[PDB]
Design an enzyme around this catalytic site. Structure first.
Site, PDB file in Angstrom:
ATOM      1  N   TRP A 130       0.899  -1.150   0.064  1.00 58.03           N
ATOM      2  CA  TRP A 130      -0.040   0.043   0.051  1.00 58.03           C
ATOM      3  C   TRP A 130       0.917   1.276  -0.030  1.00 58.03           C
ATOM      4  O   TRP A 130       1.744   1.461   0.931  1.00 58.03           O
ATOM      5  CB  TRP A 130      -0.575  -0.165   1.361  1.00 58.03           C
ATOM      6  CG  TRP A 130      -1.713   0.933   1.581  1.00 58.03           C
ATOM      7  CD1 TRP A 130      -2.890   1.713   0.932  1.00 58.03           C
ATOM      8  CD2 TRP A 130      -1.806   1.673   2.931  1.00 58.03           C
ATOM      9  NE1 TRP A 130      -3.382   2.425   1.736  1.00 58.03           N
ATOM     10  CE2 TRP A 130      -2.982   2.477   2.624  1.00 58.03           C
ATOM     11  CE3 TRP A 130      -1.044   1.602   4.089  1.00 58.03           C
ATOM     12  CZ2 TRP A 130      -3.393   3.231   3.814  1.00 58.03           C
ATOM     13  CZ3 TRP A 130      -1.400   2.631   5.026  1.00 58.03           C
ATOM     14  CH2 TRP A 130      -2.580   3.510   4.948  1.00 58.03           C
ATOM     15  N   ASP A 211       0.656  -5.458   9.767  1.00 61.23           N
ATOM     16  CA  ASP A 211      -0.261  -4.464   9.325  1.00 61.23           C
ATOM     17  C   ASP A 211      -1.523  -5.488   9.291  1.00 61.23           C
ATOM     18  O   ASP A 211      -1.204  -6.283   8.050  1.00 61.23           O
ATOM     19  CB  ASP A 211       0.116  -3.596   8.142  1.00 61.23           C
ATOM     20  CG  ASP A 211      -0.833  -2.590   7.484  1.00 61.23           C
ATOM     21  OD1 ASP A 211      -1.902  -2.481   8.200  1.00 61.23           O
ATOM     22  OD2 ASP A 211      -0.528  -2.037   6.792  1.00 61.23           O
ATOM     23  N   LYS A 246     -12.386  -2.213   7.264  1.00 59.36           N
ATOM     24  CA  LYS A 246     -13.033  -2.855   6.053  1.00 59.36           C
ATOM     25  C   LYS A 246     -13.880  -3.799   6.919  1.00 59.36           C
ATOM     26  O   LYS A 246     -15.242  -3.767   6.203  1.00 59.36           O
ATOM     27  CB  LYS A 246     -11.711  -3.322   5.237  1.00 59.36           C
ATOM     28  CG  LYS A 246     -10.905  -2.314   4.463  1.00 59.36           C
ATOM     29  CD  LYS A 246     -10.187  -1.631   5.361  1.00 59.36           C
ATOM     30  CE  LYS A 246      -9.056  -0.652   4.585  1.00 59.36           C
ATOM     31  NZ  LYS A 246      -7.607  -1.130   4.798  1.00 59.36           N
TER      32      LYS A 246
END
Ligand SMILES: *Cc1c(COP(=O)(O)O)cnc(C)c1O
Ligand SMILES: *Cc1c(COP(=O)(O)O)cnc(C)c1O
Lengths: 396, 396
Positions: A130, A211, A246
């Site tokens: 990302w 992460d 999410k």
């Protein structure tokens, strides 16, 4: 003093949204989105979340400040979620959890925590990763280096180049791993490869930083954590930045956490106060709403039973789209083999399209994707599938 | 690492808390709180806010991300509260507002922005000031210096000493001013003093930075902005970090804003882009719940009517306590003159008690106050007024 300030460059995920909007063709498609969308094309509020918000409306009596680490049950619930209900990291009181504004907020805090209270100078991230990772770590004044990861030819995890690039990392360097659903490849290690990196991690003296933004989207809440859990069995120290954006569809309420694990209770407590010191100098204390919503759902069997089902539906819709995408590409005459698309996890995936192909897609058709060829599988619905596959076949 | 991490020094304000909730003896009184309490000793949820939260529950259809700068309506309402309904700053499109996590979060982003896109290296804060101002500015790599402010003897604003120490400040240095209700002092400049400070700033090259956390608590919504507004009339550039924590009782929802103003729109747009990059590397985008509640209230005439009434009652309750405090001290034999308490604004004031007296006050029982002698007038009720004063009179 702002006269010679140079315009910051435009962000990819962000610059495409507009162009899309103002594209104003007829039957266009946005595959560059970074969020979940359902069958109908909308990003709804989970039903379990809405029931939790009514509960809070009816029970909150004050909006008085939270402690720097936020809500205690929020912290317990996440620890269990990450490390599992009976984990020893929890029973030995070896991990301390801080509620933060989003997964990104968790990341920045670990960065400031690390940059000021430690000898860390570098953090290794995959290539690719990302994009926002480099920016958070550069802000705290840390160096970011890159380790190999993706095989552009075969579309898999080049485990070798990975390991071979990770030998340049020195003892004391931070290594960042995506827990499940690697962004943007959709390619995650297997349990045996996670176990190998764990052993290699302690041997070399690396500080693992996970992460974990998609727990529940690859295989299940628990399966998605075998990797992290495989490192936690072997390490004395570790940092986990997780996010509930999410999986609870709570994107704009900024809900995540930065968990610290040390060799024991006294060291986490000593190390955590410096982490609390870093939060105080940033945003002081965290936003209550989203986190109250998460604590409330995770702690009521009724509500949690409903959330798991809702998360399962999201997971399954995504797995439908990836199968239907490689299937519809094939009926439309697809030149190449896109079957690797079914082997990847989560909402993202590199489609293996060329920068110039992505451009053609967006100009001649309404198909919008990021220049890297990354598409969000959740933006695909059975309805737009046919016109999408036909546009991509026309550009192969 | 973590092995030799040294503990962080306990935060002063957040330390009395535990000693308070450990004391648990009779008529304890906490005056070191930094929050509003009504006559019941509770920090309720404003009714205007509960009304807004129900409307939100019924109307939200997605929790998808907010733009980096947050909700537009929040940004515009904020701008009108600060600069006024027809301000030129608004009409000329000279200001850009970022929704932010708390007033503290605004300070941090003003700071990272300033530290990365500018030549600022210093920021002057009054002495004394909110203790957390040095920490946020330091964590960004800016040094903080102190100008004089309080007259330990006379219990007033040493204007002269202030203007005099501020002369050490160079051009391109940031000067930090509290818009209304100086924390911890409660002593604010007069309009004539603001204007004098506005004119001296324009000619010395100071970049002003307003911390405006108590708008509505000294005299009124508008009145409290006259100082900020005297500066904004003669400056091309300035930065405002406001908070809606105290005046909306939205303490834990993290609601605030950082407003940037420049000579004209193209500059502000260019400078603001870098402000957004700083946010994006911090926490990405902001928490929606609280800022939605504020924009919703400020936008609707009915709710804003009610909110204003609710703010007036808090403002009037504090002014009543300052008065009943200095009255109940006099009639209880207090030998010192505490009249200056009525001339101060907001929740705080220095009682002008020595370190040894606050300690004795608390151990010899009852009263808890910050070692600086700072006292939160909102922690006083007509019910504890007599014992509180008896205990103060007994230690002079
Ligand atoms: C989404 C994501 C984050 C951040 O979660 P937020 O709550 O949106 O900040 C962090 N890391 C990765 C890899 C992500 O995909
Ligand atoms: C309360 C306060 C702030 C911060 O408001 P938060 O929303 O809590 O960050 C900033 N400056 C001063 C002087 C304050 O009193």
């Amino acid at each position: 003093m702002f006269e010679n300030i140079t315009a910051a460059p435009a962000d990819p995920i962000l610059g495409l949204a507009d162009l899309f909007r103002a594209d104003e063709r007829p039957g266009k498609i946005n595959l560059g989105i970074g969020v979940y969308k359902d069958e109908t094309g909308k990003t709804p509020v989970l039903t379990s979340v809405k029931k939790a918000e009514q509960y809070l409306l009816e029970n909150e009596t004050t909006k008085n400040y939270l402690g720097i680490d936020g809500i205690p049950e929020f912290g317990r619930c996440t620890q269990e979620l990450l490390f599992g209900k009976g984990s020893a990291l929890i029973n030995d009181k070896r991990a301390r959890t801080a509620q933060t504004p989003g997964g990104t907020g968790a990341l920045r805090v670990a960065a400031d925590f690390l940059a000021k209270n430690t000898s860390v100078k570098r953090v290794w991230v995959s290539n690719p990763s990302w994009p926002n990772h480099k920016s958070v770590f550069n802000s705290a004044g840390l160096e970011v280096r890159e380790y190999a990861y993706y095989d552009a030819e075969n579309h898999t995890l080049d485990f070798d180049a990975l390991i071979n690039s990770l030998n340049e990392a020195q003892a004391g360097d931070v290594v960042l791993f995506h827990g499940c659903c690697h962004n943007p490849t959709g390619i995650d290690p297997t349990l045996e490869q996670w176990q190998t990196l764990a052993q290699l991690s302690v041997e070399k003296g690396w500080l693992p930083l996970f992460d974990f933004a998609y727990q529940g989207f690859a295989r299940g809440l628990e399966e998605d954590a075998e990797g992290l859990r495989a490192f936690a069995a072997m390490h004395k120290e570790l940092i986990v930045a997780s996010s509930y954006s999410k999986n609870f569809g709570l994107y704009n309420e900024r809900v995540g956490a930065c968990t610290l694990v040390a060799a024991d209770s006294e060291t986490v407590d000593r190390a955590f106060s410096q982490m609390k010191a870093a939060i105080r100098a940033n945003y002081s204390n965290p936003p209550a709403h989203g986190a109250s919503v998460v604590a409330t759902i995770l702690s009521n069997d009724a509500l949690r039973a409903i959330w798991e089902q809702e998360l399962t539906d999201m997971r399954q819709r995504i797995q439908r789209m990836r199968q239907l995408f490689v299937n519809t590409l094939q009926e439309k005459g697809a030149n190449r083999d896109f079957s690797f698309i079914i082997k990847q996890n989560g909402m993202f995936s590199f489609s293996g399209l060329t920068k110039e192909q992505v451009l053609r897609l967006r100009e001649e058709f309404g198909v919008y994707a990021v220049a890297s060829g990354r598409v969000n599988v959740a933006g695909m619905t059975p309805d737009n599938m046919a016109p999408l596959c036909e546009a991509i076949v026309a550009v192969l």
